[model samples]
Target: AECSVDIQGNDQMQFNTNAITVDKSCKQFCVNLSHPGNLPKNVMGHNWVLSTAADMQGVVTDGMASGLDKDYLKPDDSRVIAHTKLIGSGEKDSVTFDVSKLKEGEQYMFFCTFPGHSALMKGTLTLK
Candidate 1:
């Protein structure tokens, strides 16, 4: 940006895709998230985060208490396999993780950690 994805987040609190698949051929995978709206950071900040499907709820719950200063994510959280910094309008961020970090047949989740955003801004990440 092996293998990368460009995800779009908007003032509507929506992401352009709800599913992603990483090809087994990739050695490393990159996630690209961008905000292309006019809203300020406080009102519509967004970040792309990943974790095992089983860890999604736990990660989201704990992240809620962490607040914006930390991108609504717990500091040095172990469950986070990869993530991008929280960003606002006209901003963009990206994160790359070793493809080996993921296990085939295990489902992963990608979502925005901004409080309450997961209800819609969430997706399934899987390996092909």
Candidate 2:
């Protein structure tokens, strides 16, 4: 249903794309995350999270403390529009969210909430 987007996470702690566009026509948007590295989850897990750019820092901070079983994100965080589970090497996770939740002209962001990963694993998102 064209509901998915793919993102690659590497050992370098980076996502392949720095920016992504979500078509406004979609009723829902999805993120498919793949960690193609050799590291374990504790060392190089990565996930995709969507939120307002203004709320990025707070989200990441709280997510980090939320711990691994929670995929590093606070449970049902209102600010998180959508997110995938933290994935390790050869692991994968996907998340879907209603497109109506986003507003045009609003600055959105995507990042890996793994501890210390946001500094290098973040991206900008837009609804077009």
Candidate 3:
């Protein structure tokens, strides 16, 4: 079974895919995040952050305080289920998450919280 995913974060503050389906049998899943834009991190940075939909705003606010050094995420934040390092133009990062952390009927969401990016960059995730 395949255990990997590739996603794009473009200059338009968007992801090519709005949803990702995870195979239930996979113990671990990997996501490779790529920024296919010309803008720098402060202007058009992107990162993949996962959490319950209810937690997105709070987590993002906290993350913003942590700054880019923490990959735009709070240190040891419980709301963040998984995340990848922030990436700018021509750069990329990857992250792996334990499938067991997912719960049935619970909604999972992924977003880029580079200040205002979340308004346009977000998606849902599900296990199949």
Tell me, by TM-score, which candidate is best.
1
lDDT of 3 by residue, 18-79 (tens): 89888899999999999997999877889999999889999889988888778788899999
Error of 1 at 63 (Å): 0.8
Q: State TM-scores per candidate.
A: 0.96, 0.94, 0.94
Q: lDDT score, residue 59, model 2?
A: 97
Score residue 93 of candidate 2 by CA lDDT: 87
Instruction: Report the C-alpha lDDT of model 1 over 1-128, residue by residue, as the tens digit.
Output: 44998999999999999999999999999999999988877779889999998999999999989998988999999999999999999999989999999989999999998988898999999999
Model 1: lowest-lDDT 10 consecutive positions: 1-10
User: What ranges in model 1 sit over 4 Å off?
Assistant: none
Residue 55 local lDDT, model 1: 96
Stronger candidate by lDDT (2 vs 3): 2
The alpha-carbon RMSD values of the candidates against the true structure, listed in the order shown, are 1.0, 1.3, 1.2
- For model 2, give the RMSD to the true fold: 1.3
